[PDB]
Amino acid sequence: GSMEDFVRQCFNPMIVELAEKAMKEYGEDPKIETNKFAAICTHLEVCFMYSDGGSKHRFEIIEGRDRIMAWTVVNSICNTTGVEKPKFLPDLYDYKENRFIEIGVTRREVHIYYLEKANKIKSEKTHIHIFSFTGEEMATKADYTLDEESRARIKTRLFTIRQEMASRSLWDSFRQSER
Numbered sequence: 001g002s003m004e005d006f007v008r009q010c011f012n013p014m015i016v017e018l019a020e021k022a023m024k025e026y027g028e029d030p031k032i033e034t035n036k037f038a039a040i041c042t043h044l045e046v047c048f049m050y051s052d053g054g055s056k057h058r059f060e061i062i063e064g065r066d067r068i069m070a071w072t073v074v075n076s077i078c079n080t081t082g083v084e085k086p087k088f089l090p091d092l093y094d095y096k097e098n099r100f101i102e103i104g105v106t107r108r109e110v111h112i113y114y115l116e117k118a119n120k121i122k123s124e125k126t127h128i129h130i131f132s133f134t135g136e137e138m139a140t141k142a143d144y145t146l147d148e149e150s151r152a153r154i155k156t157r158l159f160t161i162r163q164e165m166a167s168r169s170l171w172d173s174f175r176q177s178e179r
């Protein structure tokens, strides 16, 4: 309710519109599952920030793209690099390291979400990078891909979001709602 308002105020309209569409495609109503709505918005925002954290066009964004375009990007990349085709769409491709990236944002402990992602992925080559809202991070082989300053920007954004939700008394419900 107030969470819906929070989302519409806190996130850029491009992000919010994407999230609304994404949820509706799974039969979920943004105006009802408002915690899910915020979580989806945050994860997308983190994918965009992450993609801007290195050199100009170091990263292809895959999250947020319609399915056809996403798989176009992915098949194309596996075709031009010989890198293995994932079973599920990842979040980005790193041109410098030549590997796909799965981004996780979690309210819980990072190690728990890291393991869930890892054992869902199956693809031996896709890098995993997990962020929490309380400034923790965890990445495959402890390789964090970006420099400390770019990661600090994400971590601080996430902290500010959590503080803002707390300010409005939404943080408790948000945190507990993660399944």
Ligand SMILES: O=c1cc(-c2ccc(O)c(O)c2)oc2cc(O)cc(O)c12
Residues within 6 Å of the ligand: 019, 021, 022, 023, 024, 026, 028, 036, 040, 043, 063, 091, 103, 104, 105
């Ligand atoms: O767009 C959605 C995106 C995702 C999602 C969740 C975690 C990830 O690490 C990720 O890369 C994507 O999960 C959802 C879960 C939903 O219930 C509805 C949605 O629209 C989404």
Ligand SMILES: [Mg+2]
Residues within 6 Å of the ligand: 063, 089, 090, 091
């Ligand atoms: Mg994704």
Ligand SMILES: [Mn+2]
Residues within 6 Å of the ligand: 043, 091, 102, 103, 104, 105
């Ligand atoms: Mn992800």
